[PDB]
């Protein structure tokens, strides 16, 4: 429902300048052509109206759509509050479309999102849980898709994407390795990143780099030339090759807000042992006479909990 | 969706919504059918909605039989126009369902799941309906 | 409280009752506390 209003608003805002002439031209041409569009309905509906024609009607529907999009932002803030309050470490996956942006999120975690071959299909951001291989959990978000000279009426349809980009720690621009000029996508994606960090002033987040579809690539560089951006990980989502290296380096590059301490716990208070073993990601220990030499990257709630039962060894 | 490939006459009169059905009042292809108890013009979009709901509830097994076909064209005068100056262009495809006619049939091994799928499809239709079974 | 024209059981422990001329789903879980209009 959100998309069927944003797309319609974008089409109305693109067609409003060009009403006379062209607009009446597709008013005359009503067969469901390429310009026939359809709005968010897709299966015509307002497709028989295409982008509408009347400026009065366009203006009215535009005002209603503005109000509705206003509502579906105080909906989205509510839906994201739980993540915000818990401050789970968020990782987002951006890049050019058809660059394995959804296959990666179906690969690292068994999400199961649509992976159609065509262009922009994951048009609504979806996020899924995940565990960094060694320690902390995380959340993973795949975005919509970027294009060279992106339309200027689609920024609202991309607004939720932009919000996910800003509210992130590790940004991931996935580049389609087996494609001509694997850098043209990169410059456009980066430029989108700068306009985002400018429109919403924030410290830019680290940008993790991954080259995808290198299984079918003919090595366009086949060398440090293939290291056209030398910092990157060459994953193959179709085969799951760099998953281990990606799953390792992505966590190591997210930064840890833990608190590694060494604490001992007398057996009576096994509650603390269980809480460290289920919340804190203990490295290891030896099972001591009365307690344990637990070396756990314990978090803030339990940091002061385990301060009393500390140890010096 | 569903559409006739060719129609002899594109602009027709309105289908007659009178009398109970005379043919198609029985489950003949499946095991559970959705009979109709009211008169309705059931459009192709409603048929696709019901079909998708049925095919997504069971989601694996059994066939779905859509007896009716939306071949009658319904026209629509263009907006903000005064009355007159010819009949409008075709806009809707309808099937002139009649009470007693079975609109959908289904055959799934699990009986209650099929019953619930038919219930979940009845909600997409503009009229009353009931679950009818091949075992009379 | 969920004032909807359609009130249904949602979980295994929802009971539908007629109280003061109104249909209510009373459940141990407060999230399922639904009252018909």
């Amino acid at each position: 429902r959100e998309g069927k209003a944003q797309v319609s608003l974008a089409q109305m805002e693109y067609m409003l300048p060009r009403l006379r002439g062209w607009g009446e031209s597709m008013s005359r041409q009503a067969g469901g052509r390429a310009g026939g569009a359809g709005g968010g309905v897709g299966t015509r509906g307002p497709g028989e109206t295409k982008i509408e024609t009347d400026r009065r009607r366009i203006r009215e529907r535009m005002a209603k759509l503005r109000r509705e999009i206003r509502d579906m932002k105080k909906i989205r803030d509510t839906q994201r509050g739980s993540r915000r309050r818990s401050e789970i470490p968020s990782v987002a996956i951006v890049g050019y479309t058809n660059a394995g942006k959804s296959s990666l999120l179906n690969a690292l975690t068994g999400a199961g999102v649509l992976v159609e071959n065509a262009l922009f299909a994951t048009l609504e951001p979806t996020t899924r849980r995940g565990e960094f291989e060694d320690g902390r959990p995380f959340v993973l978000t795949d975005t919509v898709g970027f294009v060279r000279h992106l339309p200027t009426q689609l920024v609202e349809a991309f607004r939720s994407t932009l919000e996910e980009v800003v509210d992130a720690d590790l940004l991931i621009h996935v580049v389609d390795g087996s494609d001509v000029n694997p850098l043209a996508q990169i410059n456009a994606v980066r430029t989108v990143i700068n306009e985002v960090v400018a429109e919403y002033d924030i410290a830019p987040p680290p940008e993790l780099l991954v080259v995808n579809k290198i299984d079918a690539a003919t090595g366009v560089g086949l060398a440090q030339l293939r290291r056209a951006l030398p910092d990157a990980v060459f994953v193959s989502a179709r085969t799951g090759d760099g998953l281990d290296k990606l799953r390792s380096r992505m966590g190591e590059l997210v930064e840890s807000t833990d608190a590694t301490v060494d604490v001992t716990i007398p057996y009576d208070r096994g509650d603390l042992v269980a809480r460290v073993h289920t919340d804190g990601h203990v490295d290891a220990t030896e099972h001591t006479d009365a307690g344990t030499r637990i070396k756990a990257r314990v978090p803030a709630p339990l940091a002061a909990t385990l301060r009393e039962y500390a140890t010096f060894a | 969706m569903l559409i006739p490939r060719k129609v002899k006459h594109r602009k027709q009169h309105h289908p007659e919504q009178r009398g109970i059905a005379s043919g198609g009042t029985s489950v003949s292809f499946g095991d559970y059918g959705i009979q109709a108890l009211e008169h309705a013009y059931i459009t192709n979009r409603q048929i696709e909605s019901a079909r998708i709901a049925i095919n997504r509830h069971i989601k694996r097994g059994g066939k779905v039989w859509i007896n009716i076909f939306p071949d009658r064209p319904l026209t629509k005068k263009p907006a903000e126009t005064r009355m007159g100056s010819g009949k409008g262009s075709p806009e809707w495809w309808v099937a002139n369902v009649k009470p007693g006619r079975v609109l959908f049939e289904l055959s799934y091994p699990d009986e209650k799941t099929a019953r619930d799928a038919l219930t979940r499809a009845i909600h997409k239709l503009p009229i009353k309906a009931r679950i009818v079974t091949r075992e009379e | 409280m969920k004032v909807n024209p359609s009130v249904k059981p949602i979980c295994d422990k929802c009971r539908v009752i007629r109280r003061h001329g109104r249909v209510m789903v009373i459940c141990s879980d407060p999230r399922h506390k639904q009252r018909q209009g």
């Binding site: 057996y267 009576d268 096994g270 006479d289 009365a290 | - | -």
Partner: protein, 132 residues
């Protein structure tokens, strides 16, 4: 009070015992070394004990033997149990020897019926999912 099946290991076992005994009150060393004295005769499988705490220092030891549910597992050479119980059977054991060596474990079974207690043991084995 606790029918804990303390492991047969006579080489440094409290941590495993220390939790289960520090949630209550019993001498850790006394309990450990008395169970270790029992294991001096019981090195097969760690025999079970029911420590009967009343208010302090229960000092009670009764034997119920360790992997009865898998005495068959222990006395076949096959380990890891069976992670696919009845999906496919895992391992091979002898059908006569279960009926025979059910004698040792019949000391705490339900009934004295021979073939039926053998079926008890066959049930505990087939719980893994294995042929016997």
């Amino acid at each position: 009070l606790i029918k804990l099946q303390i492991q047969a290991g006579q080489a440094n076992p409290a941590p495993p015992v220390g939790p289960a005994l520090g949630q209550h009150g019993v001498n850790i060393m006394e309990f450990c070394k008395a169970y270790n004295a029992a294991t001096e005769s019981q090195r097969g499988n760690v025999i079970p004990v029911e420590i009967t705490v009343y208010e302090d220092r229960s000092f009670t030891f009764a034997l119920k033997t360790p992997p009865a549910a898998k005495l068959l597992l222990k006395a076949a050479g096959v380990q890891k149990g069976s992670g696919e119980p009845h999906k496919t059977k895992v391992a091979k054991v002898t059908w006569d020897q279960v009926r025979e060596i059910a004698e040792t474990k019949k000391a705490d079974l339900n009934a004295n019926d021979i073939d039926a207690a053998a079926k008890i043991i066959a049930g505990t084995a087939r719980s893994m999912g294995i042929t016997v």
